[PDB]
Amino acid sequence: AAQTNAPWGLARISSTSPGTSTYYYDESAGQGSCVYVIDTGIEASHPEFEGRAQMVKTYYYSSRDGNGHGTHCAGTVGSRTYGVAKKTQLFGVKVLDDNGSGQYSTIIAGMDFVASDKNNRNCPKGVVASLSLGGGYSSSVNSAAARLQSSGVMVAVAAGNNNADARNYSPASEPSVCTVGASDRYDRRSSFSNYGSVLDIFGPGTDILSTWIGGSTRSISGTSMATPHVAGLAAYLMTLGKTTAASACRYIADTANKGDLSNIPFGTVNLLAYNNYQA
Ligand SMILES: [Ca+2]
Ligand SMILES: [Ca+2]
């Protein structure tokens, strides 16, 4: 399948070079996989989700996304127009309030919830969790991410937006999950992206057009935007049977575009998520 005039990030993910505008992908499009977007929620009624999105848990007064960020992330995972994995199932877990903030205890709870909740869902091709959040190092947040991953969910987490070594941030610094840095459309490391040896992979993170609350769309930037590209790609690849939750991050790294990025500091991988699609 080919989506023409796609958002640049989706194009980038299916090309060996920057500058293209078509997103090439297999029609399976992540069908039968499930992605949990652990964030501010998801506006499930957005037409772009085509009924494939559902809120499953909230830690606040409502399950609504009053922020936008979770909806945006979910859209890059699996909205029709803006998503990597256009037929995946999306589950929202609202661990962040409508200001986009949340206590580590809540974020942990949300991760443990997903490890359990996945056992009640029909996700025959596998389960992904996209965590576009982070703060200062916490061994207990890391251990939560590690447990989620160990439970059989492919955990993709944002590197963080401090232009710093991601080793001081959580759950970015948990080695067992898939820590995602951001790139821009010119194949530069996004100026805000964390870096370091704990990064597994880069994805498109600057000026990413996706869904937003009120049935709207908008373009925002962040490692938060890169993570769902990688999470969507994992769901997509799992649906194709190319990899499993346990080894998707490594598969993605192994099949990545290598060496294409600029301003990558010594010690950080130069790997850009790539779907390897061939028609
Ligand atoms: Ca290249
Ligand atoms: Ca890792």
- Asked whether 68 and 94 are in contact (CB, 8 A), the reply is no
Instruction: For residues 245 and 150, give the distance between their C-alpha atoms in angstroms, rounded to a whole number.
Output: 9
How far apart CA 123 and CA 224 sit, in angstroms, is 24
* CA proximity to 160, closest of 230, 223, 241: 223
Query: How many Å apart are CA 229 and CA 83, to the nearest integer?
Result: 8
The residue to which tokens 């001081």 are assigned: 168
Torsion angle, CA of 194/195/200/206, rounded to 10 degrees?
A: 50
* CA dihedral over 270, 274, 278, 279, signed as positive or negative: negative
Q: Tell me the torsion sign for CA atoms 45, 51, 53, 59.
A: positive
Burial profile 185-194: b = 16 or more Cβ within 10 angstroms, e = fewer = bebbbbebbb
How much distance in Å is there from the Cα of 84 to the middle of ligand 1?
A: 20
* Tokens coding 112: 């443990």
Task: Give the closest ligand to the alpha carbon of residue 249.
Answer: 2
CA distances from 101 to 39, 66, 264 (A): 9, 12, 29
Rounded Cα distance between 245 and 238, Å, is: 7
Over the Cα atoms of the chain, what is R_g? Answer: 16
Q: Are 118 and 34 in contact (CB under 8 A)?
A: yes
Q: Given the residues 39, 97, 165, 184, select the one marked as catalytic.
A: 39
**Domain residue ranges in the chain:** 1-279
Element (H, E) at 36: strand 33-39
Phi-psi region of 76 (alpha: psi -120 to 50; beta: other; left: phi over 0): alpha
Instruction: Looking at the CA of 252, name the nearest ligand.
Output: 2
Whether 257 contacts 271, CB under 8 Å: yes
Taking the C-alpha atoms of residue 61 and residue 56, their distance in angstroms, rounded to an integer, is 14
69 given a catalytic annotation: yes
Ligand 1 centre to CA of 254 (Å) is 14
Closest by CA to 129, choosing from 174, 86, 93, 95, is 93
CATH fold, domain 1-279, is Rossmann fold (3.40.50)
Told to judge if 224 belongs to the known catalytic residues of this protein, a careful annotator would answer yes
200 labeled part of a ligand binding site: yes
Cα end-to-end distance, the chain, whole Å: 8
DSSP at 120? G
Q: Which residues contact 138 (CB under 8 A, 6 or more apart)?
A: 104, 170
Question: What Cα–Cα distance (Å) separates residue 54 from each residue in 36, 64, 258?
Answer: 10, 11, 36
Q: Which ligand is nearest to the CA of 248?
A: 2
Whole-angstrom Cα distance, residue 117 to residue 162?
32
Contact of 95 with 39, CB cutoff 8 Å: yes
**How far is Cα 25 from Cα 170, in angstroms, rounded to an integer?**
32
- What's the CA-to-centroid distance between 202 and ligand 1, angstroms? 13
Strands of 79-207 (E only): list them: 89-94, 126-131, 135-136, 153-158, 169-170, 178-183, 201-204
Point out which residues pair with 129 in neighbouring strands.
36, 155
- How far is ligand 1, taken at its centre, from the CA of residue 261, in Å? 9
The residue annotated as part of the active site, out of 69, 165, 173, 193, is: 69
Distance 88 CA to ligand 1 centre (A): 28
- Token pair listed for 33: 């996989």
Residue 167 CB: number of other CB atoms within 10 A?
17
Placement of tokens 């028609």 in the chain: 279
CA pair distance 216, 56, nearest whole angstrom:
22
